[PDB]
Design a binder for this molecule. Structure first.
Ligand SMILES: CNC(=O)c1nn(C)c2ccc(Nc3nccc(-n4cc(N[C@@H]5CCNC5)c(C)n4)n3)cc12
Length: 265
């Protein structure tokens, strides 16, 4: 878990600026590993974030190499070279619809695993999906993540920063976070991906988003997004937690549509 700082080389320039994200290199048993490092420069939160990641083992989740306590607290992770999914899509507007399905399906596989492992992500958004390649997505940013209690299906937040546009109505109304509330967030993530990284509920206040959802209104279908994918987004946005599908059902719908699109092309 605790890394040797002598074996870590950080780059001067930062990838993003909580703290900062920097590129580095970790001298391993034989090969040198390119890493992305979360630098605090909050400590308990970074250690809790590292503890969650240490427990996760899935191809569609960012792997943590370890933690290092130096001039600042550091979270060292395997590098996903292409960066955040939203920024990638904003910069590469010609990514094909089939490719977008492939990527959101990968996110759904990672989330199906998280749900099976009884962890709630609580910040599932396109800015928190990183690309290894144009055809390989991983989920990152476990800072708000919680291991569910053995006797409960949800995490109850004691007191209300929250990305409200990604949050299910029960998160807002009852401060209850479950895998079903991550399904809601995943619906918003699908909308962002098919909208090529555009922000959801454009120009609206958090209170206006709450009022809109309460009226039963939902975001429209993004340009070029297939009806089947929009139908899935709307299903993720099922107001009532009990009637909302879980990730096993969401991943299966995506898997089947993806292979239908693959074999049609
Ligand atoms: C803010 N800008 C960036 O992160 C970023 N910009 N560019 C150009 C990048 C290129 C590669 C990677 N590669 C990577 N590979 C593995 C892990 C990470 N991580 C990033 C976060 N936080 C960022 C804050 C919210 N979501 C992401 C965490 C926790 N891990 N990044 C990240 C970035």
């Amino acid at each position: 878990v605790y890394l040797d700082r002598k074996l870590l080389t950080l780059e001067d320039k930062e990838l993003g600026s909580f703290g900062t994200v920097k590129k580095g290199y970790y001298q391993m048993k034989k090969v040198v590993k390119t890493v992305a490092v979360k630098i605090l420069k909050l400590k308990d939160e970074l250690l809790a974030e590292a503890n969650v990641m240490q427990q996760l083992d899935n191809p569609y989740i960012v792997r943590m190499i370890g933690i290092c306590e130096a001039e600042s607290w550091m979270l060292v992770m395997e590098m996903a070279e292409l960066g955040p999914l939203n920024k990638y899509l904003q910069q590469n507007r010609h990514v094909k619809d089939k490719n977008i399905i492939e990527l959101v399906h990968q996110v759904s596989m990672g989330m199906k695993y998280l749900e099976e492992s009884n962890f709630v992500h609580r910040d599932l958004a396109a800015r928190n999906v990183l690309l290894v390649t144009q055809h390989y997505a991983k989920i990152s940013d476990f800072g708000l993540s919680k291991a569910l209690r053995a006797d409960e299906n949800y995490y109850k937040a004691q007191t209300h920063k929250w990305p409200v546009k990604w949050y299910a109505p029960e998160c807002i109304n009852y401060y209850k976070f479950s895998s079903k509330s991550d399904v809601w967030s995943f619906g918003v993530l699908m909308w962002e991906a098919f909208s090529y990284g555009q922000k959801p509920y454009r120009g609206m206040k958090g209170s206006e988003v709450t009022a809109m959802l309460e009226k039963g209104e939902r975001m429209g279908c993004p340009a070029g997004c297939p009806r089947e994918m929009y139908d899935l987004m709307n299903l993720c946005w099922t107001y009532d937690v009990e009637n909302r599908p879980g990730f096993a059902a969401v991943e299966l719908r995506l898997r089947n549509y993806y292979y239908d699109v693959v074999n049609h092309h």
